[PDB]
Design a protein around this motif. Structure first.
Motif, PDB file in Angstrom:
ATOM      1  N   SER A  43       7.475  14.221  -1.281  1.00  0.00           N
ATOM      2  CA  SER A  43       7.094  14.311   0.125  1.00  0.00           C
ATOM      3  C   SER A  43       6.731  12.944   0.688  1.00  0.00           C
ATOM      4  O   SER A  43       7.084  12.624   1.829  1.00  0.00           O
ATOM      5  CB  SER A  43       5.931  15.287   0.292  1.00  0.00           C
ATOM      6  OG  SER A  43       5.487  15.329   1.637  1.00  0.00           O
ATOM      7  N   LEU A  44       6.021  12.125  -0.093  1.00  0.00           N
ATOM      8  CA  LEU A  44       5.650  10.793   0.373  1.00  0.00           C
ATOM      9  C   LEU A  44       6.885   9.925   0.579  1.00  0.00           C
ATOM     10  O   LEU A  44       7.021   9.255   1.609  1.00  0.00           O
ATOM     11  CB  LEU A  44       4.683  10.142  -0.617  1.00  0.00           C
ATOM     12  CG  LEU A  44       3.230  10.626  -0.601  1.00  0.00           C
ATOM     13  CD1 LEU A  44       2.509  10.194  -1.867  1.00  0.00           C
ATOM     14  CD2 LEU A  44       2.502  10.104   0.630  1.00  0.00           C
ATOM     15  N   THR A  79       4.279  16.213  -4.694  1.00  0.00           N
ATOM     16  CA  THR A  79       3.645  15.405  -3.659  1.00  0.00           C
ATOM     17  C   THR A  79       4.378  14.082  -3.471  1.00  0.00           C
ATOM     18  O   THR A  79       4.473  13.572  -2.347  1.00  0.00           O
ATOM     19  CB  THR A  79       2.176  15.161  -4.011  1.00  0.00           C
ATOM     20  OG1 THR A  79       1.560  16.402  -4.379  1.00  0.00           O
ATOM     21  CG2 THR A  79       1.432  14.570  -2.823  1.00  0.00           C
ATOM     22  N   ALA A  94       0.390  14.719   1.312  1.00  0.00           N
ATOM     23  CA  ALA A  94       1.024  13.435   1.593  1.00  0.00           C
ATOM     24  C   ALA A  94       0.396  12.762   2.806  1.00  0.00           C
ATOM     25  O   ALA A  94       0.236  11.537   2.829  1.00  0.00           O
ATOM     26  CB  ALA A  94       2.526  13.627   1.802  1.00  0.00           C
ATOM     27  N   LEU A 115      -3.057  11.369   1.686  1.00  0.00           N
ATOM     28  CA  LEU A 115      -2.958  10.155   0.884  1.00  0.00           C
ATOM     29  C   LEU A 115      -2.543   8.957   1.726  1.00  0.00           C
ATOM     30  O   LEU A 115      -2.934   7.825   1.419  1.00  0.00           O
ATOM     31  CB  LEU A 115      -1.985  10.366  -0.277  1.00  0.00           C
ATOM     32  CG  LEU A 115      -2.537  11.204  -1.436  1.00  0.00           C
ATOM     33  CD1 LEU A 115      -1.423  11.628  -2.379  1.00  0.00           C
ATOM     34  CD2 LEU A 115      -3.618  10.438  -2.188  1.00  0.00           C
ATOM     35  N   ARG A 116      -1.759   9.177   2.785  1.00  0.00           N
ATOM     36  CA  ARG A 116      -1.419   8.078   3.682  1.00  0.00           C
ATOM     37  C   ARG A 116      -2.644   7.594   4.443  1.00  0.00           C
ATOM     38  O   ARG A 116      -2.804   6.390   4.676  1.00  0.00           O
ATOM     39  CB  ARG A 116      -0.326   8.508   4.661  1.00  0.00           C
ATOM     40  CG  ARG A 116       1.070   8.571   4.073  1.00  0.00           C
ATOM     41  CD  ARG A 116       2.116   8.692   5.172  1.00  0.00           C
ATOM     42  NE  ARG A 116       1.971   9.927   5.938  1.00  0.00           N
ATOM     43  CZ  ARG A 116       2.546  11.081   5.613  1.00  0.00           C
ATOM     44  NH1 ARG A 116       3.307  11.163   4.530  1.00  0.00           N
ATOM     45  NH2 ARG A 116       2.358  12.154   6.369  1.00  0.00           N
ATOM     46  N   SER A 150       0.824  -1.205   0.000  1.00  0.00           N
ATOM     47  CA  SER A 150       0.000   0.000   0.000  1.00  0.00           C
ATOM     48  C   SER A 150       0.859   1.256   0.000  1.00  0.00           C
ATOM     49  O   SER A 150       0.460   2.283  -0.558  1.00  0.00           O
ATOM     50  CB  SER A 150      -0.935  -0.003   1.208  1.00  0.00           C
ATOM     51  OG  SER A 150      -1.851   1.077   1.168  1.00  0.00           O
ATOM     52  N   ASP A 180       1.819   1.633  -3.465  1.00  0.00           N
ATOM     53  CA  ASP A 180       0.636   2.024  -4.227  1.00  0.00           C
ATOM     54  C   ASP A 180       0.341   3.512  -4.070  1.00  0.00           C
ATOM     55  O   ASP A 180      -0.023   4.184  -5.041  1.00  0.00           O
ATOM     56  CB  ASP A 180      -0.564   1.179  -3.795  1.00  0.00           C
ATOM     57  CG  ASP A 180      -1.880   1.718  -4.319  1.00  0.00           C
ATOM     58  OD1 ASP A 180      -2.616   2.349  -3.531  1.00  0.00           O
ATOM     59  OD2 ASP A 180      -2.168   1.526  -5.519  1.00  0.00           O
ATOM     60  N   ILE A 181       0.504   4.045  -2.858  1.00  0.00           N
ATOM     61  CA  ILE A 181       0.328   5.480  -2.651  1.00  0.00           C
ATOM     62  C   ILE A 181       1.373   6.262  -3.438  1.00  0.00           C
ATOM     63  O   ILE A 181       1.070   7.299  -4.042  1.00  0.00           O
ATOM     64  CB  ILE A 181       0.378   5.810  -1.148  1.00  0.00           C
ATOM     65  CG1 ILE A 181      -0.786   5.140  -0.415  1.00  0.00           C
ATOM     66  CG2 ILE A 181       0.342   7.312  -0.927  1.00  0.00           C
ATOM     67  CD1 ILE A 181      -0.724   5.285   1.087  1.00  0.00           C
ATOM     68  N   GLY A 219      -4.898   6.092   1.821  1.00  0.00           N
ATOM     69  CA  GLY A 219      -4.250   4.864   1.395  1.00  0.00           C
ATOM     70  C   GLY A 219      -4.339   3.779   2.447  1.00  0.00           C
ATOM     71  O   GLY A 219      -4.496   2.599   2.125  1.00  0.00           O
ATOM     72  N   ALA A 220      -4.235   4.164   3.722  1.00  0.00           N
ATOM     73  CA  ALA A 220      -4.493   3.209   4.792  1.00  0.00           C
ATOM     74  C   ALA A 220      -5.931   2.717   4.736  1.00  0.00           C
ATOM     75  O   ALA A 220      -6.196   1.528   4.936  1.00  0.00           O
ATOM     76  CB  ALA A 220      -4.195   3.841   6.148  1.00  0.00           C
TER      77      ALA A 220
END
Ligand code: HEM
Ligand code: HEM
Ligand code: HEM
Ligand code: HEM
Ligand code: HEM
Ligand code: HEM
Ligand code: HEM
Ligand code: HEM
Ligand code: HEM
Ligand code: HEM
Ligand code: HEM
Lengths: 142, 145, 147, 140, 142, 147, 140, 145, 140, 147, 140
Positions: B87-88, B84, D61, D64-65, B70, B73-74, D68-69
């Motif tokens: 940053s992830l 973005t 971010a 999306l976490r 996951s 996937d993000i 996404g979770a």
């Protein structure tokens, strides 16, 4: 008899059917599927390149190599001194492989059927394609 | 650029053709477990490092597998936004610096295990774009490791 | 280190096939000869590797056919950019063939790039030399890997 | 409550509602925007993730976490023992964040707020039960 | 060897080729026309369902029944306990009909050719389709 | 008495295939088991007709495969709605098979409808239960005709 | 709970979601269709209004009366003494129809199901409180 | 509804693909005579009831066939307008009440004879829509009979 | 006069002009509308078929019967003995309706008025002869 | 002397096939009989050339089939107008067949044109007689060339 | 017969049917093309005006003169003494051209053939009377 006008006609229709990118794999798929359908004992000649699975990457790289050589020859139909030097090199890469001499007319028939199936059957000059394809394979085989 | 908008666009489409929540959880775990088998083989990292110990029947490892996939996937779905996405990946890198035994080579192995498995479950995959984008993803997670 | 992107290879493939198509005449020999003329002019030692294909006489049919045979090999790999699963096989094929040729080192493919970097802007219409460098490397690295 | 039949329904509608690529980013931002509009006190809890600018990469971010979770939790809805282990993991992470049940109640009402606006068909009954499944596992 | 990744690949491409509504009759038409073209003495096995006229409603209901059974099996490739119970029931519906054992590999070849013709030949995994189709028919025949 | 219209069957066929597609896993067993779980719960006598397929143990592979085999039979008839010339053959085929099963009456297919009427709204996304009733009858009447 | 501010929010979103002309008819049919899919026992309660065919004029007329009653109740949300009198009227009409609290719970979850699918913005928190206002007045 | 707009739309298209004035009169009579052979067999109604007595060589019966089929053709082409179609069927019903020996079952036979013949001359026909719409047409002509 | 060649021509142009489905209904209404505008006395003859409202189903049904009778008469133009029997049938039906030759003359001029407006090609000479064929058989 | 243009033959081919299509009945005989009825009426001597196909009895199946056989030969050549490489072969074929029939002169094809010039306006809907004359000549000249 | 009311009707419909610029040229060619298809003997009468090629400028110029003469005759329909003088002029010009009444009958049927195909509304009754007005004046 592969006249000079036959060469312009074959070169154009070959390029149109050969194409760019993955279009060449579509033409190759037509040729090999037709060849192996008529001459099934020819598939064993390609055991080194995974002939049992023509959709494998190993065989597709072999197919595009073959079509590239044919493209290399069709492009040089009007430059016979270079054409003969090409076919002589191609002939050296085929003898001592045990290729049945009947496999070359069979390949010619399948290749003409594929180009004809791609570019359209109407007006298709089988006289020009057979005569100029024979000039290619006769320099490769024997 | 490495992983252009075109590369990012097609990787996302093929990945989400293979990975989404509309699919069964067993199908999701089957891909993730297969990705870890490729990673374990190519990296030589101990399965005992993870909860469940690589036991594909351990619900802990299956859940641990889900969190890793996951995360990728993000990141994949944010490839069209390098602002973005950087940053992830920076969040994942600081998360993995705190973990002992995580090296940039192992991250590159696990990132490459995603591409090879996607190409097995989807042979039409654009494996070059999958290579450039996953290398960019791995360079973030394993930066400094 | 540089990524041949989807936009990169789409640009190279179209520009390349536009000049190298089989529908045209006299083109392939003039281009491929200029590539090797530039190649030997940047490393005069490289010419000695082609004594079997009559390198000392470029206008010989034995050498012109070598130039067409070599560059049309690049045409095969260029049009495989939309299928890198097949391209990797082809590049490994070309690599093993060059590994079995005594005297072919990796630094030669650096010089071969300069040869194409000189010839293509003169002959290609909408030539984006920036896209060409990255995707040529993608191909040349696949062959040079090993030697 | 969130039986095998309803899990399929929820997994399906979450797919087309969540979307792909940047549609997940706007979706994730709409969720927390609606979370704050439903509970203004919730906004301060995200001071560490650039909530000053909700369009910033730092806050996007984080969104999306969290979505996404949610995405991975939705995926393993039909694998009871897998989502239980994953909810147990997430629960330990939120345990020190000083959250109460109304924080997860405001989140669900934000989920019920955003998700259907990207759908033609929505079953809030199944979504209510299946969210309570996830929230109770994360809240503790 | 029908790996778990082969199952996801086969299940997806099967659904894409199988399709919905009358698309399934297009896939069936491909399979039977190819089977009867190679193994013509197999058409007699379907005399009860008007095998001489595959375009009849009687045979089409038989074709979609067959494709439905294959779809039923492909969907259960990842659920082997249920898959074996399905194949055992299918096997009981085929013995005492005198089906030549060579007809099952022939059916596999025609079915792979139809799916490949529908979903596209490029990248097609013949290794995964042959291995997982063999797991199906081997539970039905013998 | 109610007509499964062209708009009706087009709606059912799309919604049905969206959930029952072979591209998904774990779905078919959970749905088909719930259908029979509802069926036996509405007529406990019906369970005795399935002693050959291990009805007393639902999680047995012998019974789960029966549920998939039966409901996938409905999937076959549902996707035939765009070809009623073929559907009539299939329904007569299923009818004669059920006529040769001692204890299968027409009133059972009324109870089978209630089973699908309960399960489908829980599992199908855009479920129009009004279209489902008319087209299920179109199919169930074809099989139940005779018994 | 459904204060003066939230009533404006709910009245606004009900307007564009409900629509005009035949969009109210499809909306009203979607509501009861989702009501039945959420609670199958509810369908029998409408045997007197042509529920056999949900596209029939008899059943569509019933759906428009129920959504129209919702429409007029939403309108007088900001007039507390007016909606109280109208809810009191509706309560006496439903008192003899053998309905329980889950029937009004299934209706609200159908309202939360249908309404947002015709919107870009939806606040389920305000809609939850403002629906409980109406339901408690009609249920008794 | 029974015979929706979709049902009515496709029945009209297939029917007018098989029946129009641009075709020869022999082709028109060949379909109508074949429809009456199906009707005579399925209903058991005496051909002597009609002018010409079912003699497919009698110009009277061929003209009598034309009037019956043209009536169904007018009704079929008005299926997209139930308001106008109910009026047309009501005219035919009052026309057939005055006729002795016309029963609703016989009308359903003749209406079904149209569907079976259309499916023979056009196998791609949507036989379900042909069933629902022709049943609606028959219910009007044979109402009270 | 309306020979085998001209009958094909007329049958062809009647097909695309008449049309299918509701195009026959508007066509049929245009014919009688133009019939009345050409002869005002003709309108009273149709008092039994709702001529009060020419868009009514009662009058539209009459127009489709008359144009449908034309449709079947056009079809059997090339079967001389068949259309003779059908014209003989129609003649007996109109015999008691107190019509004169100008009524059939106004009808034909309405046919020549409406039909070509839905065509790109029209041959009024062949249509004149082939209509006189039908009218003389119906008038007597 | 007059050129059957691309626009000319496209107009003739569509109008001709619209009337002469095999999907219709009774048409071909009525048209082809009228063509020969006009032909003999413009040159009574021409009838004597058809004693083998029962010209003295037009309603005989032996003569009606001759009219269909002859006019459908024109249909074959009309639909070849979009392939004049094939049309030239067909016209030479018909020419040699007519050269081997004693008494068939070129002036007869002038009279055959008048026959079609009379029949076609009566039967064809959107008949452009100006395009018909030029393209009929293109065909009739190919057959009449030689006699 | 072609009274003041009908002349307005005919003048109106001739305007939009005839058109302007090249639409008059195609119109004029369609008229004589349909004139020849209705009477094959008429084509020889125009051997002096390039009837060999009906698209030629020589024949198109003749067609525009004939339709233009129709155009000016239609214009003065409501000026009885003016069109009488103009019809008298045209009559003397055609007197030596060996034309009979069927030639003007074929022309009118060509007028009734072409004109309405460029219209949505056509009244053949008024056009029949008003054409007979013009033809009788030109024929003599
Ligand atoms: C115009 C006709 C043909 C052309 C242009 C052609 C060209 C080529 C080329 C370029 C290669 C690649 C050689 C390499 O890089 O190793 C090749 C390989 C080969 N070709 Fe041909 N070929 C032709 C006809 C045929 C036919 C008819 C057969 C057999 C019936 C055949 C059998 C083979 C085999 C066995 C190989 C080597 C396979 C391997 O490397 O494992 N070729 N050919
Ligand atoms: C593309 C590659 C990778 C991605 C996307 C990724 C992402 C993640 C994520 C999202 C988590 C869970 C975070 C959480 O608990 O909230 C995690 C945990 C973990 N990862 Fe990675 N990781 C990657 C590579 C690796 C590698 C190469 C290793 C070891 C060599 C590794 C070792 C671990 C371990 C041991 C944990 C457990 C931490 C815990 O349970 O709290 N990861 N990873
Ligand atoms: C993108 C770069 C290159 C490509 C695609 C390429 C491809 C090829 C091809 C298609 C052949 C065909 C000869 C055969 O197989 O029979 C060949 C042969 C050969 N290549 Fe390359 N080549 C590349 C670069 C180079 C360079 C840089 C060198 C050395 C400086 C080199 C040295 C040779 C030699 C010596 C031969 C054999 C000569 C002979 O046939 O006698 N190649 N190569
Ligand atoms: C209900 C389902 C929820 C899920 C699936 C979820 C998931 C997550 C995830 C994946 C993270 C990222 C942690 C990391 O990567 O280090 C996170 C962080 C966080 N979440 Fe949640 N969460 C949920 C509920 C909530 C709610 C309702 C709140 C508050 C009202 C909340 C408050 C936070 C905070 C404060 C953080 C850390 C922010 C920071 O680092 O400054 N969570 N959550
Ligand atoms: C994956 C492979 C196959 C599957 C899934 C399959 C499945 C089916 C199914 C579902 C039926 C319907 C049984 C019924 O309702 O009566 C059937 C019937 C039948 N199948 Fe197969 N089949 C397969 C292979 C074959 C092959 C290879 C043959 C012959 C060469 C064959 C011959 C028959 C025959 C003869 C019948 C009965 C025909 C009749 O009822 O008149 N099947 N099969
Ligand atoms: C739409 C409704 C139904 C459909 C499409 C259907 C279809 C099927 C199918 C596909 C089978 C496969 C078994 C085989 O052929 O080997 C089957 C068997 C059977 N069905 Fe049905 N069925 C329906 C309703 C019912 C109902 C309502 C009952 C009884 C209450 C029933 C009783 C049975 C039994 C007893 C068997 C055989 C059990 C066994 O295999 O031992 N069916 N049916
Ligand atoms: C929650 C807001 C509700 C509103 C605004 C509302 C309003 C209405 C209205 C206006 C009518 C029309 C009465 C008439 O015109 O005679 C009606 C009838 C009815 N309502 Fe409701 N209602 C609500 C809740 C419910 C619920 C939740 C149910 C059942 C689950 C229900 C069951 C019925 C029944 C059974 C009828 C009569 C149907 C018949 O006549 O057969 N109502 N309602
Ligand atoms: C779809 C079914 C039917 C249609 C559309 C239909 C319509 C018509 C029409 C339009 C006519 C002629 C009206 C006229 O003369 O102006 C007619 C006449 C007649 N019909 Fe029917 N009809 C149907 C069914 C039947 C049946 C089932 C019977 C007998 C069992 C029947 C018996 C007759 C007879 C005897 C006549 C002769 C009346 C006469 O010549 O005046 N018809 N019908
Ligand atoms: C010229 C071709 C004509 C055809 C094909 C034709 C055909 C028909 C048909 C089929 C009907 C229906 C009778 C029934 O179903 O009971 C009818 C009725 C009638 N027609 Fe005609 N007709 C024609 C000419 C005319 C004309 C020119 C007039 C008057 C100017 C006329 C006046 C009537 C009247 C008054 C009725 C009966 C209306 C009523 O019932 O109130 N017909 N005709
Ligand atoms: C475009 C003009 C014409 C075409 C396309 C045409 C074509 C044909 C065709 C298809 C046949 C078939 C008979 C066969 O081959 O067995 C035929 C035969 C014949 N044609 Fe022609 N024809 C044309 C004009 C004429 C004319 C103008 C004449 C004489 C005045 C003529 C005299 C004959 C004769 C005598 C026969 C053989 C009669 C027999 O079968 O006994 N044709 N022609
Ligand atoms: C009915 C209304 C008619 C009108 C308004 C009309 C008008 C005209 C006009 C303006 C011209 C041009 C004379 C010139 O400029 O020298 C003309 C010429 C002619 N018209 Fe007409 N005309 C009519 C009827 C006819 C008809 C019906 C025919 C034959 C069927 C006819 C045969 C001719 C001929 C033969 C010429 C002379 C062509 C030549 O010079 O070779 N006219 N007419």
């Amino acid at each position: 008899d592969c006249t000079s006008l036959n060469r312009l006609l074959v070169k154009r229709q070959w390029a149109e059917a050969y194409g760019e990118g993955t279009n060449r794999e579509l033409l190759g798929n037509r040729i090999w599927e037709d060849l192996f359908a008529n001459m099934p004992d020819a598939r064993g000649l390609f055991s080194r390149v995974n002939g049992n699975d023509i959709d494998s990457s190993e065989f597709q790289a072999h197919s595009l190599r073959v079509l590239g050589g044919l493209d290399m020859c069709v492009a040089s139909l009007d430059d016979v001194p270079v054409l003969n030097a090409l076919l002589a090199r191609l002939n050296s890469q085929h003898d001592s492989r045990g290729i049945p001499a009947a496999g070359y007319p069979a390949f010619v028939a399948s290749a003409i059927s594929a180009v004809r199936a791609t570019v359209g059957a109407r007006s298709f000059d089988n006289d020009a394609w057979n005569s100029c394809m024979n000039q290619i394979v006769s320099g490769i085989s024997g | 650029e490495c992983c252009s908008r075109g590369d990012a666009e097609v990787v996302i489409s093929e990945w989400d053709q293979v990975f989404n929540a509309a699919m069964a959880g067993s199908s999701e775990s089957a891909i993730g477990v297969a990705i870890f088998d490729v990673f374990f083989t190519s990296s030589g990292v101990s399965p005992s490092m993870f909860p469940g110990g690589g036991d594909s029947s351990s619900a802990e490892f299956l859940a641990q597998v889900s969190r890793v996939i996951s995360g990728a996937d993000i990141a994949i779905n944010s490839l069209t936004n390098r602002a973005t996405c950087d940053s992830l990946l920076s969040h994942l890198n600081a998360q993995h610096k705190a973990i002992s035994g995580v090296t940039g080579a192992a991250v590159t192995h696990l990132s490459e295990a995603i591409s090879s498995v996607v190409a097995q479950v989807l042979p039409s995959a654009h494996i070059d774009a999958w290579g450039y984008c996953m290398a960019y993803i791995a360079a973030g997670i394993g930066a400094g490791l | 280190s540089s990524c041949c992107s989807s936009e990169d290879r789409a640009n190279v493939m179209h520009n390349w096939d536009a000049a190298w198509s089989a529908a045209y005449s006299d083109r392939r020999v003039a281009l491929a000869q200029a590539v090797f003329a530039s190649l030997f002019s940047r490393d005069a030692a490289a010419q000695g590797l082609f004594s079997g294909v009559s390198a000392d006489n470029p206008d010989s049919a034995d050498f012109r056919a070598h130039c067409v045979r070599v560059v049309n090999g690049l045409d095969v790999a260029i049009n495989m950019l939309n299928d890198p699963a097949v391209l990797n096989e082809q590049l490994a094929h070309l690599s093993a063939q060059h590994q079995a040729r005594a005297g072919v080192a990796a630094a030669h493919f650096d010089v071969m790039a300069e040869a194409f970097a000189e010839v293509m802007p003169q002959v290609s219409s909408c030539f984006s030399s920036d896209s060409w460098n990255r995707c040529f490397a993608r191909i040349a690295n696949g062959i040079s890997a090993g030697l | 409550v969130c039986n095998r039949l309803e899990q399929i329904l929820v997994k399906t509608q979450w797919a087309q509602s969540y979307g792909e690529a940047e549609n997940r980013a706007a979706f994730s931002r709409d969720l927390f925007s609606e979370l704050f509009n439903i509970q203004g006190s919730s906004r301060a809890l995200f001071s560490g993730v650039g909530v000053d600018d909700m369009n910033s990469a730092a806050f996007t971010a984080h969104c999306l976490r969290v979505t996404g979770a949610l995405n991975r939790l939705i995926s393993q809805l039909d694998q009871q023992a897998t989502i239980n282990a994953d909810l147990a993991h997430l629960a330990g992470q939120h345990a020190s964040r000083n959250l109460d049940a109304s924080n997860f109640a405001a989140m669900g009402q934000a989920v019920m707020s955003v998700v259907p606006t990207h759908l033609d068909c929505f079953n809030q009954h199944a979504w209510g039960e299946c969210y309570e499944r996830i929230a109770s596992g994360i809240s503790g």
